[PDB]
């Protein structure tokens, strides 16, 4: 269906205001997340089909910011956004981030970059999403 | 190629329509040159002498009075001035449009 | 991307698809119907006006063209005979058609339409007047059974409704042509049956029965997934629902 | 190339030569007596007549076509005046149609009249003598188009006249046609 | 290269070979275990990580190239308590007021206006079928070992469009979506399809309505084929099968009709891994000679432990579209079982009759034909959909 109603506004607002922190740490992103209480998004009389579909679309939309050509800090913010969306969802089973084959190797290389950048919060969160297997190996996002 | 080679009279080719400021300049040349359609054709390089004759023939149908009025509104003749006036007025027409 | 809709193979310069294959040939020979035959389109008001207009035009043509034929033939013979008396007699027979064209032109439209079972060129009405958008026998049915002014088009009166309900039982709710004729209101068997079924307690159910419950349960167990079932498609298998 | 099937002309385009040629003969007979041919190139008339005859033999499959769209399939080229003849004939048939009530009742126009000519041609001579205003032995004018526009005024007697061309000429008019030495030198500079 | 990419963005993709495409996944996932069908441990609050720490910290240090204490610090900092604005137990049925989301403001606008006697209800959101397909199959495992999805198996998503095109809308599509496995063959997808065209019947029986035919089209004809990338895959497992591809090619290749040359193969020749296909591109499938289905591969992906691993449910129907029933013209309420022509009683031709109305209108108490008409048995695609 595409961009969920009003979701892109919130996602871009959070991502930009995080990027304005000049910081890469997960704690600042969580402070912004909890100040405006982003985690409440999955409530709101969402019957199961809408819950799952909105989770899928939101994770793909955040994927688009987790991908290039965005720079390191904004990609890190997008990774935190993906983590928050995935781990605050109320789905059963937990719906997944759609990851393309053209994106999977670039994203493993991004894991390597996060490790080498010493900004280990993003690297750990990516490995945590892998352990949760939030990433879905799908042809397209 | 096919046997149905339609034939009709094509001498009536599409010529560029005459402009209003161009018509005013034609009347000015009538005033300041006369009815020498060859020298007018030189003054109007866009228009060949036969176009000048055709313009005379069309204008004389109703605007012969204007032909006479222009012809009596005599002026000193300068080729360079006429060329500058033509190009400047046409450029100003384009800018206005 | 949507250009691939059926048929998947469509010709660019001619617009047709592949010919009928063997299986389709044998299916047609066996009378097995295709799903494209299931498309039906509604009669809209201007279509009904067009049908009346076409029928009146057809009747007027059928009436006048013989008259114009007589006029022209008598004129042609009048033009070539040298006998004066025969010339005048042929002119008289031409004047007959000359007056008859005027008289027929002045007829009222109802007189032009005539009786419900009068002859019409349904093929010509279909393939010229209607541009072929509706078939000949379809137009014939519509006209002669619903649209020709002699068919009853009025709402059912209370007395008519009760008498329909009362007499339908004597025939066992069968033989509805007899029911329609006995009702005496010039209804058609289809009209009577439609009215009766829209209020028949034996068809439309507040109630339930063992076989209906059995079929509903079996179809539900066969086809339900979670909360979903095809509520209004189960109607086909057990009777009296919609 | 309409007389046999081809990828350019599927069956809905194919037609029998006899029917269309009869229709075109029935159309050209109308053309001349209506003054349409005199003074004109005829082949436009033939082209328009053939195009409309082919259309009306199966209009449901053919009213969607067009002059060029037609002529290109049979590898034929068409006159531009073909459209002029088409407009003329369409006006003529719309004038014809109003004479019969069972054609008038359909309120025919350019879109619809094409499929009805099969009915009009069966009474043509009757339509003509109910349609022309010139009822003399020798409602609408049966006169060539060049006058159907109506003269602005109907040729009053021309002003045949003479003048006294022996009078003295005004030298001022003669001298006005002469360039001054200033203008002569201007011409020399320009030349 | 068999490297996915869009041809028209978010509408269709460039071509790749399915088997090489799966191997291209597995060269980046094999041995790592992220593609597996076994349950991994999940993220949780920092206060209960003690049991998981021994296993998690060593692996985190190994992969992140950091110390055990650094791994513990990352695990504590990245705990879900920093993200769970919702406590474990809060219900989804109400919008929390303690939020600044524009999305939840728009959701408030969606929900609140329905809280009126005219609109209070718990009906469907937009469409009913999809989650019902997911819930009844998602997360299950088979009772038989032979019906188990192989780890890392490719899962395609195939949209089988109905033969009944709306012919007033073209953006959205009539289809039912079925998932298929890469290793499985086209024969199995052909067999799974429940389309009504297999049930087609006919014949004229106005004189003897009870003599309806004993054979459905499935019993008389069994022809069917898929068409991908210019090749046909026709079924020939039964004598009731004819190779319709030959009939199609012999006409389509005779002129520059707008299509390229084609090639012929059987249904049983190809697995879905053997295909080279485009996602979102309209391909073709057909059966019973005239029942063409447009085939669109809407998705292809690896299997994962959260997926339906019970292969008895495959090809896994996952979406469907809701055709309307053909209701009788007499009663305008019940579904038709008969259709008549030349009917002197019916107001129109054709006229559709239910079994109850058909028999009573056209026959007497003992079943003799009355009036003039022709009748045919009818199976409703608006019902058997
Ligand atoms: Zn099939
Ligand atoms: Zn039913």
């Amino acid at each position: 269906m595409g961009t969920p109603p009003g979701l892109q506004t919130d996602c871009e607002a959070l991502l930009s205001r995080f990027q304005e922190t000049d910081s890469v740490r997960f704690e600042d992103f969580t402070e912004l997340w909890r100040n405006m209480k982003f985690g409440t998004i999955f409530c709101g009389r969402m019957r199961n089909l809408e819950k799952n579909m909105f989770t899928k679309e939101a994770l793909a939309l955040a994927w688009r910011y987790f991908l290039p050509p965005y720079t390191f800090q904004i990609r890190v913010g997008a990774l935190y956004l993906l983590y928050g969306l995935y781990n605050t969802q109320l789905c059963q089973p937990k719906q997944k981030i759609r990851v393309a084959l053209k994106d999977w190797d670039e994203v493993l290389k991004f894991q390597q970059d996060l490790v080498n950048a010493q900004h280990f919060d993003a690297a750990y969160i990516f490995r945590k999403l892998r352990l949760d297997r939030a990433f879905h190996f799908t042809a397209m996002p | 190629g096919s046997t149905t080679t339609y034939s009709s009279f094509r001498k009536n080719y599409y010529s560029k329509p005459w402009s209003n400021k161009e018509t005013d300049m034609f009347f000015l040349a009538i005033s300041m040159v006369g009815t020498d359609f060859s020298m007018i054709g030189q003054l109007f390089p866009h228009r060949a002498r036969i176009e000048i004759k055709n313009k005379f023939k069309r204008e004389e149908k109703t605007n012969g009075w204007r032909i006479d009025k222009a012809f009596q509104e005599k002026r000193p003749f300068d080729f360079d001035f006429f060329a500058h006036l033509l190009q400047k007025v046409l450029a100003e027409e384009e800018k206005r449009k | 991307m949507g250009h691939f809709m059926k048929p998947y193979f469509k010709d660019k310069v001619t617009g047709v698809g592949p010919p009928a294959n063997e299986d389709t040939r044998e299916k047609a020979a066996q009378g097995i119907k295709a799903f494209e035959e299931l498309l039906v389109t509604k009669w809209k008001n201007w279509e009904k006006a067009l049908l009346r207009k076409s029928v009146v035009s057809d009747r007027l043509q059928r009436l006048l063209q013989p008259k114009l034929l007589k006029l022209e033939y008598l004129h042609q013979k009048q033009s070539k005979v040298s006998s004066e008396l025969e010339r005048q007699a042929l002119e008289k027979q031409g004047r007959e058609a000359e007056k008859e064209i005027q008289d027929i032109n002045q007829l009222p439209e109802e007189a032009l339409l005539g009786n419900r079972l009068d002859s019409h060129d349904w093929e010509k009405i279909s393939n010229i007047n209607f541009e072929g958008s509706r078939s000949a026998e379809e137009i014939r049915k519509f006209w002669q059974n619903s649209e020709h002014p002699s068919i009853n088009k009025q709402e059912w009166s209370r007395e008519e409704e009760e008498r329909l309900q009362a007499i339908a039982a004597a025939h066992g709710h069968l033989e509805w042509q007899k029911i329609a004729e006995e009702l005496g209101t010039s209804r058609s068997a289809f009209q009577c049956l439609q009215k009766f079924q829209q209020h028949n307690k034996a068809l439309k159910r507040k109630e339930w029965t063992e076989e209906e419950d059995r079929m509903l349960t079996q179809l539900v167990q066969e086809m339900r997934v979670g909360s979903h079932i095809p509520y209004r498609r189960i109607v086909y298998y057990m009777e009296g629902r919609d | 190339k309409l007389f046999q099937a081809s990828p350019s002309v599927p069956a809905k385009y194919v037609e029998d030569k006899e029917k269309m040629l009869s229709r075109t003969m029935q159309l050209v007979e109308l053309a001349n007596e209506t003054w349409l041919v005199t003074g004109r190139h005829p082949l436009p008339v033939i082209t328009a007549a053939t195009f409309l005859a082919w259309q009306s033999l199966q209009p449901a499959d053919r009213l969607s076509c067009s002059l060029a769209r037609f002529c290109k399939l049979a590898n034929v080229d068409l006159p531009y005046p073909a459209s002029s003849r088409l407009q003329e004939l369409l006006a003529v048939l719309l004038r014809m149609a109003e004479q019969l009530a069972w054609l008038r009742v359909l309120r025919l126009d350019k879109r619809s009249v094409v499929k009805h000519i099969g009915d009009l041609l069966q009474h043509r001579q009757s339509l003509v003598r109910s349609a022309f205003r010139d009822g003399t032995a020798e409602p609408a004018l049966l006169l060539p188009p060049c006058m159907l526009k109506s003269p602005k005024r109907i040729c009053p007697v021309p002003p045949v006249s003479t003048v006294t061309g022996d009078e003295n000429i005004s030298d001022s008019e003669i001298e006005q046609y002469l360039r001054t030495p200033q203008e002569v030198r201007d011409f020399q500079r320009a030349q | 290269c068999n490297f996915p990419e869009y041809e028209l963005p978010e509408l269709n993709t460039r071509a790749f070979h399915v088997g090489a495409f799966g191997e291209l996944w597995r060269g980046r996932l094999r041995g790592a275990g992220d593609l597996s069908l076994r349950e991994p441990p999940a993220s949780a609050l920092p206060g209960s990580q003690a049991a998981d720490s021994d296993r998690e910290d060593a692996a985190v240090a190994r992969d992140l190239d950091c110390s055990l204490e650094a791994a513990a610090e990352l695990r504590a900092v990245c705990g879900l308590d920093k993200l769970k604005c919702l406590e474990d137990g809060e219900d989804p049925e109400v919008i929390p007021e303690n939020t600044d989301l524009v999305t939840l403001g728009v959701r408030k606008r969606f929900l609140e206006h329905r809280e009126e006697t005219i609109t209070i209800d718990r009906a469907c959101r937009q469409e009913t079928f999809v989650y019902e397909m997911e819930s009844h199959a998602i997360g299950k495992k088979p009772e038989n070992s032979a019906d188990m999805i192989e780890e890392g198996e490719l899962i395609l998503s195939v949209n089988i469009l109905y033969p009944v095109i709306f012919h007033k809308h073209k953006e959205h599509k009539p289809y039912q979506t079925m998932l298929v496995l890469g290793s499985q063959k086209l024969t199995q997808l052909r067999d799974s399809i429940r389309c009504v065209s297999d049930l087609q019947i006919g014949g004229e029986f106005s004189n003897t309505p009870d003599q309806a035919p004993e054979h459905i089209s499935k019993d008389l004809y069994k022809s069917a084929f898929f068409y991908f990338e210019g090749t046909f895959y026709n079924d020939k497992r039964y004598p009731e099968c004819r190779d319709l591809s030959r009939t199609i090619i012999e006409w389509s290749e005779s002129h520059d009709r707008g299509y390229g040359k084609f090639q012929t193969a059987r249904m049983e020749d190809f697995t879905f891994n053997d295909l080279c296909i485009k996602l979102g591109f309209p391909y073709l499938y057909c059966h019973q000679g005239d029942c063409e289905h447009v085939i669109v591969i809407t998705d292809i992906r690896l299997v994962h432990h959260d997926d339906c691993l019970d292969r008895t449910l495959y090809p896994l129907l996952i979406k469907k579209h809701w055709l309307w029933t053909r209701k009788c013209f007499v009663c305008k309420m019940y579904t038709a079982r008969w259709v008549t022509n030349n009917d002197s009683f019916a107001p129109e031709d054709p006229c559709f009759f239910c079994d109850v109305c058909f028999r009573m209108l056209h026959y007497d108490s003992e079943g003799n034909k009355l009036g003039e008409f022709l009748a045919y048995p009818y199976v409703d695609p608006g019902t058997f959909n």
Side-chain angles (χ1 to χ4, degrees):
Chain A
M1 182 305 278
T3 291
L7 178 63
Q8 182 165 1
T9 297
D10 289 324
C11 294
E12 291 182 10
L14 171 59
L15 290 171
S16 180
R17 201 265 167 268
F18 174 65
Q19 187 182 355
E20 287 182 338
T21 64
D22 299 334
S23 179
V24 291
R25 290 295 195 171
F26 180 58
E27 293 192 309
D28 292 322
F29 182 95
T30 66
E31 285 292 300
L32 300 177
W33 183 273
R34 285 177 282 107
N35 285 352
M36 71 165 258
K37 295 286 181 172
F38 201 116
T40 56
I41 202 158
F42 301 106
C43 329
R45 212 169 293 170
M46 247 196 200
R47 278 72 61 67
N48 294 313
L49 181 56
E50 178 65 0
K51 190 171 57 173
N52 286 10
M53 291 325 88
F54 179 92
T55 304
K56 291 176 188 180
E57 294 284 43
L59 295 172
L61 173 61
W63 188 250
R64 307 202 300 212
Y65 307 98
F66 176 72
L67 291 178
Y70 293 103
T71 68
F72 185 98
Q73 191 200 5
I74 165 67
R75 291 180 72 172
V76 162
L79 180 62
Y80 303 154
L81 171 64
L82 287 161
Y83 190 50
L85 287 166
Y86 182 84
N87 291 95
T88 62
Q89 79 182 282
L90 301 177
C91 315
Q92 292 292 356
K94 294 173 185 175
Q95 298 304 298
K96 307 299 185 180
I97 308 165
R98 290 181 59 85
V99 173
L101 178 58
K102 63 166 190 73
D103 308 338
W104 179 236
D105 58 90
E106 159 57 30
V107 163
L108 289 175
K109 190 281 309 187
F110 193 59
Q111 184 183 336
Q112 165 269 103
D113 291 336
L114 295 174
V115 165
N116 288 1
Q118 184 261 7
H119 305 161
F120 294 119
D121 313 328
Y124 176 90
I125 282 168
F126 182 73
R127 194 178 191 277
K128 201 58 162 176
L129 286 166
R130 287 183 64 182
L131 288 182
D132 285 356
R133 297 177 191 158
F135 308 120
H136 218 190
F137 309 118
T138 56
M140 65 315 272
Chain B
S2 184
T3 56
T4 71
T5 294
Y6 172 59
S7 183
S8 65
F9 198 44
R10 174 51 201 181
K11 292 196 78 171
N12 323 137
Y13 64 92
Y14 168 62
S15 59
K16 302 306 189 293
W18 274 71
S19 158
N20 63 331
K21 290 292 174 67
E22 182 182 34
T23 298
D24 293 339
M25 212 85 67
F26 158 85
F27 284 109
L28 173 63
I30 292 288
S31 316
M32 161 294 288
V33 187
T35 74
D36 183 348
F37 303 163
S38 192
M39 143 59 95
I40 301 288
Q42 294 191 238
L43 287 158
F44 293 88
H46 181 64
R47 303 296 184 180
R49 177 269 183 188
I50 67 177
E51 299 41 46
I52 306 307
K53 184 178 63 167
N54 200 299
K55 185 59 166 172
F56 170 88
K57 295 301 297 173
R58 295 204 311 287
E59 292 309 327
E60 74 172 351
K61 300 192 300 183
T62 286
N63 299 321
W65 64 263
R66 197 179 177 198
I67 296 289
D68 189 274
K69 190 178 189 294
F71 190 94
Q72 296 201 65
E73 183 248 339
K74 292 182 170 171
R75 185 183 175 94
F77 167 29
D78 187 47
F79 196 103
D80 193 13
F81 170 77
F82 192 77
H84 279 79
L85 183 67
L86 174 62
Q87 330 332 326
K88 283 179 175 183
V89 171
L90 291 176
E92 285 176 24
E93 279 294 318
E94 294 303 330
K95 289 175 182 179
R96 291 291 184 180
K97 289 167 165 57
Chain C
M1 160 272 278
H3 63 285
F4 285 108
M5 292 145 188
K6 195 187 183 186
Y8 191 85
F9 307 112
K10 57 173 65 67
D11 176 299
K12 184 56 60 176
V13 66
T14 291
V16 312
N21 61 63
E22 292 88 337
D23 296 348
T24 63
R25 199 284 296 178
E26 294 184 332
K27 286 173 73 186
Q30 290 176 324
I32 296 173
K33 291 196 165 299
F35 294 163
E36 293 79 7
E37 303 180 50
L38 311 177
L39 302 183
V40 178
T41 188
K42 299 169 182 62
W43 289 85
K44 294 168 295 300
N45 52 57
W46 69 85
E47 304 175 63
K48 302 182 183 182
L50 176 63
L51 181 53
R52 180 177 172 104
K53 195 173 185 177
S54 301
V55 178
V56 303
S57 188
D58 187 48
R59 286 297 305 256
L60 187 53
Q61 287 160 17
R62 274 178 158 244
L63 288 167
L64 289 176
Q65 290 172 353
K67 305 303 184 173
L68 297 174
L69 182 160
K70 177 177 173 175
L71 202 165
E72 190 155 80
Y73 179 63
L74 273 293
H75 182 279
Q76 188 269 5
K77 284 322 161 203
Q78 177 194 336
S79 81
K80 71 185 298 289
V81 298
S82 60
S83 178
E84 178 57 19
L85 282 297
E86 295 172 72
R87 191 187 71 84
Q88 292 180 23
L90 295 165
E91 176 171 7
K92 182 179 179 180
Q93 290 164 89
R95 296 298 182 170
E96 288 176 356
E98 181 184 81
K99 307 324 180 192
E100 287 168 26
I101 172 63
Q102 294 185 347
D103 292 346
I104 290 164
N105 178 39
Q106 291 176 16
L107 289 171
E109 196 173 73
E110 296 294 309
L112 299 178
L113 287 181
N115 154 39
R116 193 175 68 97
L117 305 182
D118 286 345
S119 185
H120 307 120
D121 37 31
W122 303 113
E123 296 84 355
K124 192 268 181 179
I125 295 162
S126 174
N127 71 18
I128 272 282
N129 281 77
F130 268 80
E131 315 290 356
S133 66
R134 293 194 175 275
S135 64
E137 192 66 24
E138 167 192 355
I139 290 165
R140 180 184 174 194
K141 292 332 191 191
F142 184 68
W143 186 255
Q144 298 198 295
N145 303 347
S146 189
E147 185 51 24
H148 176 281
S150 71
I151 293 93
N152 195 339
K153 299 179 183 181
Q154 303 297 345
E155 178 61 304
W156 297 80
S157 299
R158 187 276 301 171
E159 61 86 29
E160 192 183 20
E161 294 188 333
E162 324 325 290
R163 288 195 304 117
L164 176 77
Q165 290 286 340
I167 75 197
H171 302 277
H173 314 290
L174 267 280
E175 307 180 65
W176 283 84
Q177 183 63 23
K178 298 185 180 174
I179 291 166
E181 288 174 15
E182 181 161 26
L183 191 63
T185 54
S186 305
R187 297 286 183 185
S188 69
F190 185 104
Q191 277 199 26
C192 295
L193 180 63
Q194 171 241 317
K195 181 63 172 175
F196 141 70
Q197 290 286 76
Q198 286 189 255
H199 305 299
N200 178 18
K201 293 183 177 179
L203 186 75
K204 194 169 187 174
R205 282 142 157 70
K206 280 182 168 191
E207 71 86 30
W208 288 92
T209 59
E210 299 187 329
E211 82 285 52
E212 293 183 31
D213 270 359
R214 185 274 186 183
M215 197 62 175
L216 174 66
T217 303
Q218 291 293 331
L219 290 167
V220 166
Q221 195 274 340
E222 174 68 4
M223 201 171 166
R224 88 172 300 108
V225 186
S227 188
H228 181 78
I229 59 154
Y231 307 84
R232 297 180 165 97
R233 306 191 189 85
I234 293 177
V235 177
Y236 180 102
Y237 308 97
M238 41 76 68
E239 280 155 28
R241 306 300 170 174
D242 36 8
Chain D
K1 300 168 186 58
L2 301 169
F3 317 124
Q4 71 283 350
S6 97
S8 304
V9 286
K12 75 188 295 178
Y13 301 83
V14 175
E15 194 53 75
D16 194 338
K17 68 189 72 75
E18 161 270 315
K19 295 184 293 175
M20 30 205 302
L21 82 85
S22 184
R23 291 274 267 263
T24 57
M25 181 46 238
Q26 293 161 299
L27 288 162
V28 304
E29 73 183 358
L30 171 74
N32 210 327
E33 62 95 9
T34 57
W35 311 86
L36 187 154
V37 192
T38 298
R40 281 72 181 295
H41 292 57
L43 164 144
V45 189
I46 291 77
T47 44
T50 70
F51 180 39
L52 273 284
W54 169 86
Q55 282 192 231
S56 63
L57 287 163
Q58 304 186 41
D61 293 308
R62 298 179 181 164
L63 177 58
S64 59
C65 202
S66 179
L67 273 165
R69 185 172 175 174
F70 203 31
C71 295
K72 76 191 190 83
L73 305 175
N75 186 332
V76 202
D77 153 28
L78 47 63
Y80 167 48
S83 71
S84 173
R85 302 317 103 85
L86 179 55
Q87 294 294 351
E88 246 294 291
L89 76 88
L90 287 168
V92 169
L93 325 161
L94 293 173
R95 160 178 165 265
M96 272 315 98
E98 295 290 292
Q99 312 315 323
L100 291 173
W102 54 266
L103 295 175
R104 197 177 189 135
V105 71
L106 296 323
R107 317 297 170 191
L108 300 184
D109 63 2
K110 295 190 178 79
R111 297 292 186 157
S112 58
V113 74
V114 67
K115 80 181 189 286
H116 297 288
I117 49 193
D119 302 324
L120 279 80
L121 69 81
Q122 146 204 42
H123 307 302
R124 176 59 56 63
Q125 46 279 356
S126 294
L127 311 184
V128 169
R129 71 194 178 202
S130 55
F132 60 56
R133 194 183 292 188
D134 309 273
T136 53
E138 189 265 27
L141 280 58
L142 185 51
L143 300 175
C146 49
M147 52 195 48
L148 293 183
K149 65 179 66 180
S150 74
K152 304 303 90 174
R153 57 186 184 165
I154 310 179
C155 55
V157 186
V160 178
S161 55
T162 59
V163 302
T164 61
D166 308 320
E167 80 279 52
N168 179 277
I169 286 155
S170 189
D171 282 35
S172 59
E173 179 72 355
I174 306 307
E175 289 178 16
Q176 279 283 31
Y177 297 134
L178 305 176
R179 287 193 183 95
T180 57
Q182 192 284 323
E183 288 160 286
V184 168
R185 285 174 288 166
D186 286 345
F187 195 104
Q188 288 175 340
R189 194 180 71 261
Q191 187 173 44
Chain E
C1 302
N2 294 300
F3 183 88
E5 251 290 19
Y6 292 124
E7 178 177 324
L8 298 177
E10 306 191 329
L11 181 60
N12 60 29
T13 72
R14 306 183 196 186
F16 53 81
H17 184 275
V18 176
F21 165 87
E23 284 300 299
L24 287 167
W25 292 112
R26 292 186 292 249
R28 299 166 173 69
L29 292 171
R30 182 180 283 135
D34 298 338
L35 84 183
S36 178
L37 301 183
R38 49 224 160 61
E39 297 78 7
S43 198
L45 299 174
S48 63
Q49 292 174 342
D52 299 342
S53 67
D54 36 45
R55 180 267 176 187
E56 182 163 355
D57 296 350
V60 171
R62 189 190 302 147
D63 290 353
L64 306 191
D65 194 16
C66 76
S67 66
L68 281 296
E69 164 295 309
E73 179 179 72
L74 292 164
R75 174 177 50 73
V77 168
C78 307
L80 297 187
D81 66 324
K82 320 310 175 199
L83 293 172
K84 282 190 177 189
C85 301
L86 301 170
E87 297 296 343
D88 291 343
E90 296 194 51
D91 54 330
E93 302 289 57
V94 179
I95 298 169
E97 300 88 347
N98 60 330
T99 193
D100 293 349
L101 291 169
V102 176
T103 282
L104 294 185
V106 172
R107 200 95 62 69
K108 196 70 167 170
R109 186 264 290 188
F110 296 164
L111 299 186
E112 292 294 341
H113 76 269
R114 310 193 81 247
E115 305 213 348
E116 174 57 74
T117 56
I118 299 160
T119 53
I120 282 288
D121 60 35
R122 206 173 183 268
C124 186
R125 132 76 165 185
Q126 170 174 7
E127 62 190 2
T128 295
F129 207 76
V130 181
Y131 177 72
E132 310 316 308
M133 320 326 279
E134 293 185 340
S135 58
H136 91 298
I138 200 72
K140 288 190 174 175
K141 296 178 188 176
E143 299 189 336
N144 314 313
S145 211
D147 298 319
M148 183 61 175
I149 312 300
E150 300 184 16
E151 303 205 56
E153 174 59 319
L154 281 165
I155 310 300
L156 287 75
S157 173
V158 188
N159 287 25
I160 300 105
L161 280 75
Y162 306 155
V164 184
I165 302 296
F166 306 134
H167 64 274
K168 284 92 185 189
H169 290 82
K170 73 185 72 76
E171 300 91 330
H172 58 69
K173 304 294 191 283
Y175 64 85
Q176 61 191 322
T177 304
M178 301 184 183
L179 311 186
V180 295
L181 315 182
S183 60
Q184 282 193 177
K185 289 190 175 187
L186 306 182
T187 51
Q188 289 154 317
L189 183 58
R190 172 265 185 205
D191 294 344
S192 76
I193 288 160
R194 302 291 85 190
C195 184
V196 195
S197 305
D198 277 357
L199 315 183
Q200 279 169 2
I201 63 174
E204 201 290 306
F205 293 105
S206 57
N207 290 32
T208 48
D210 295 336
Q211 298 183 335
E214 298 183 42
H215 306 283
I216 59 161
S217 292
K218 207 177 179 60
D219 304 327
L220 300 174
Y221 318 98
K222 295 182 194 294
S223 312
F225 65 85
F226 290 87
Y227 163 100
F228 300 116
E229 69 165 314
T231 73
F232 298 87
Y233 299 102
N234 282 69
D235 195 357
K236 184 42 201 163
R237 292 173 294 165
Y238 332 121
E240 292 74 27
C241 301
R242 296 194 175 109
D243 190 1
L244 298 177
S245 68
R246 180 188 53 65
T247 306
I248 294 161
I249 47 154
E250 287 182 323
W251 176 84
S252 59
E253 294 193 349
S254 67
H255 186 71
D256 54 306
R257 305 199 181 281
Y259 304 99
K261 43 62 192 170
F262 300 145
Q263 184 268 9
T264 291
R266 291 197 182 187
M267 202 56 107
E268 65 264 35
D269 293 340
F270 264 54
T271 68
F272 289 100
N273 286 344
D274 299 309
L275 300 169
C276 183
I277 203 154
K278 295 184 181 189
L279 314 181
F281 187 91
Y283 294 108
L284 167 70
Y285 165 89
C286 185
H287 67 135
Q288 334 313 110
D290 53 30
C291 185
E292 297 179 16
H293 299 162
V294 177
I295 296 294
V296 179
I297 317 302
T298 44
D299 200 13
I300 188 182
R301 62 180 186 85
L302 299 195
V303 71
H304 179 254
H305 92 79
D306 294 303
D307 290 326
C308 181
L309 310 182
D310 183 355
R311 201 168 66 83
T312 68
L313 304 180
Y314 282 72
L316 189 75
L317 176 67
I318 191 159
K319 189 163 184 174
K320 194 167 182 171
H321 276 256
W322 315 274
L323 299 183
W324 307 353
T325 56
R326 179 57 70 230
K327 300 184 181 183
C328 167
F329 299 174
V330 178
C331 63
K332 299 187 177 183
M333 63 90 74
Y334 195 82
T335 311
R337 303 204 197 126
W338 288 92
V339 64
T340 70
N341 302 106
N342 307 83
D343 188 331
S344 57
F345 301 135
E348 298 186 56
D349 188 337
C351 187
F352 282 85
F353 292 86
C354 65
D355 221 348
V356 177
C357 291
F358 175 64
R359 290 170 180 268
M360 103 165 88
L361 185 58
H362 302 90
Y363 303 88
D364 60 17
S365 39
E366 317 56 33
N368 154 15
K369 187 182 176 174
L370 331 171
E372 293 189 337
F373 70 104
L374 300 180
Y376 303 83
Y378 173 62
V379 172
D380 179 31
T383 289
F384 285 74
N385 175 60

